[PDB]
Design a protein around this ligand. Structure first.
Ligand code: MET
Lengths: 99, 274
């Protein structure tokens, strides 16, 4: 009755230092709909994060896109942190430009 | 190519106080165009694509009326289902409804569908002929009988086969500049070494619309699925979609492998090689 979220963290564009890009965290395949998703910069929660309107797939599982602008640099580490009833601990997925 | 209009509706009960959280979204193909959120201040169906903004206040009044009616039906059904399954007042529960229509390349009706879930499991759905119901369990069967006696299927079929298709044509026309445009995948390959004997080739497809795509790997011209990883297609956030597929290969043998990309925007499938 509970389905744990799948998580992808990625940029909208090829990641280029110095240029306003967009950091996405795409959560999918989860049920129930209540979920907590944060985007992290060097481990700290980013405050101005928006998300898509809740929708769902053919198998009834839910998906959401959480997103924020950012001008990437090469020092700054980014991640997506998710909590859900199916997770005993929050799951963190680091952004890796190569995925 | 083929097109579709789909509406999605989610209601989540709020046991301790007040009415369910209710969220509705409409899509043409892979483009969201409207939303309603019970938690939002407008209490109106709201536009989410520029081409629907054309519609006049009579449209917005009609859709707002219909969407609020759906929210009440969900509210009532949450109660009914709680009682049918003998559940307590303590727990939050969910209903989900989806319906809409597919048309082919001639924009003629192909298929319609109308389906309903409780707590993320199938409950009741209209069959493909739009004339009968599939009920998953005895609660849903009681619902089936109630919708049969009230000739629900007849009303829905007329919408799905007629009205739905007519709206979809309208929007495809009004939104033609994006909705009738295909955006072919922008592709490249990357190379990563794990160790001096194993390498990963990753074949990227970016900035494509619509979302449907096939990425496949071959070795010496023969399909290879082992030692591959395909991520779920994902939204870029600008309306387009992304995907990648990766294969692990023996370092030095990268030239044997090719990535093949199929998409509606590509008149011939593309081949990439390291
Ligand atoms: C936004 S709720 C109404 C959905 C759809 N336009 C219909 O007439 O059923």
């Amino acid at each position: 009755i509970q389905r744990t979220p799948k998580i992808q963290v990625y940029s909208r564009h090829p990641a280029e230092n110095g240029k306003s890009n967009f950091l996405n965290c795409y959560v999918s395949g989860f049920h129930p709909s209540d979920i907590e998703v944060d985007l992290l910069k060097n481990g700290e929660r980013i405050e101005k994060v928006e998300h898509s309107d809740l929708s769902f797939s053919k198998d009834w599982s839910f998906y959401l896109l959480y997103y924020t602008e950012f001008t990437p640099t090469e020092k700054d580490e980014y991640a997506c942190r998710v909590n859900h009833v199916t997770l005993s601990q929050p799951k963190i997925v680091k952004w890796d430009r190569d995925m | 190519g083929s097109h579709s209009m789909r509406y999605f509706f989610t209601s989540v009960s709020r046991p301790g106080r007040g009415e369910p959280r209710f969220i509705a979204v409409g899509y043409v193909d892979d483009t969201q165009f409207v939303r309603f959120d019970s938690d939002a201040a407008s209490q109106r169906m709201e536009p989410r694509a520029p081409w629907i903004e054309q519609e006049g206040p009579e449209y917005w009044d009609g859709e707002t009326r219909k969407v609020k009616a759906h929210s009440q039906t969900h509210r009532v059904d949450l109660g009914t289902l709680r009682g049918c399954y003998n559940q307590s007042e303590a727990g939050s529960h969910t209903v989900q409804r989806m319906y809409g229509c597919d048309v082919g390349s001639d924009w003629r009706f192909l298929r319609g569908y109308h389906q309903y879930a409780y707590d993320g499991k199938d409950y009741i759905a209209l069959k493909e002929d739009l004339r009968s119901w599939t009920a998953a369990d005895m609660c849903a069967q009681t619902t089936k009988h109630k919708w049969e006696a009230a000739h629900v299927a007849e009303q829905l079929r007329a919408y799905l086969e007629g009205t739905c298709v007519e709206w979809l044509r309208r929007y495809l026309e009004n939104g033609k500049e994006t909705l009738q445009r295909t955006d072919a995948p922008k592709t490249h390959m990357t190379h990563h070494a794990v160790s001096d004997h194993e390498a990963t080739l990753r074949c990227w497809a970016l900035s494509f619309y619509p979302a449907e795509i096939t990425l496949t790997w071959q070795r010496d011209g023969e399909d290879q699925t082992q030692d591959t990883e395909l991520v779920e297609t994902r939204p870029a956030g600008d309306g387009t979609f992304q995907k990648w597929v990766a294969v692990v290969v023996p370092s030095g043998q990268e030239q044997r492998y090719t990535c093949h990309v199929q998409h509606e925007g590509l008149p011939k499938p593309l081949t990439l090689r390291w």
